[PDB]
Amino acid sequence: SGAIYVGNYRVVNRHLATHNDWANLVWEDSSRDLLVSSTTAQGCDTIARCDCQTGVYYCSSRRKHYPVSFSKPSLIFVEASEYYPARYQSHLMLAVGHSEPGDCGGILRCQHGVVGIVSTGGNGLVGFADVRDLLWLDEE
Ligand SMILES: NC(=O)[C@H]1CCC(=O)N(C[C@H]2CCOc3ccccc32)C1
Numbered sequence: 001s002g003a004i005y006v007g008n009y010r011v012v013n014r015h016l017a018t019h020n021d022w023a024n025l026v027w028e029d030s031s032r033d034l035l036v037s038s039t040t041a042q043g044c045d046t047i048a049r050c051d052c053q054t055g056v057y058y059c060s061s062r063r064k065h066y067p068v069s070f071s072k073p074s075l076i077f078v079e080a081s082e083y084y085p086a087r088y089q090s091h092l093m094l095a096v097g098h099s100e101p102g103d104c105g106g107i108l109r110c111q112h113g114v115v116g117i118v119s120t121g122g123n124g125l126v127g128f129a130d131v132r133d134l135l136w137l138d139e140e
């Protein structure tokens with residue numbers, strides 16, 4: 001589990017969104033595994049606006065933050081899980097790192113801010129949904 005809290009937005013994995021998230025929906029995209037809802041309180045996270053390919057992510061199944069090298073956001077085939085059939089997921093970045101289903105939502109960050117959240121993984125992979133192109137998270 002986990003979310004990004006920027007401005008009056010809450011960014012979560014679409015497959016983990018709550019009823020309250022759907023009842024206060026701003027934007028969702030199944031192909032990216034992302035959903036954004038509105039919040040009453042202002043958050044403290046800031047979004048990275050960069051092309052970094054190195055950063056650090058939080059892994060809840062290890063209680064640890066790991067430094068990783070990751071690929072550029074791309075269209076990658078992801079195996080079937082409890083939440084999606086086997087399909088192509090867009091804006092996904094891959095790295096070598098530990099991962100388990102409960103880990104969706106951990107933040108990946110670089111020197112500029114939050115880059116994305118855990119969304120895919122398995123066999124020593126972990127995949128991150130990018131949020132750096134969502135410029136509207138910084139305003140309104
Ligand atoms: N964005 C998606 O399509 C995800 C939906 C939920 C989901 O469980 N997965 C499987 C991934 C998540 C990361 O970690 C692992 C490690 C082991 C097994 C499976 C997985 C895919």
Ligand SMILES: [Zn+2]
Pocket residue numbers: 048049050051052110111112113
């Ligand atoms: Zn950066």
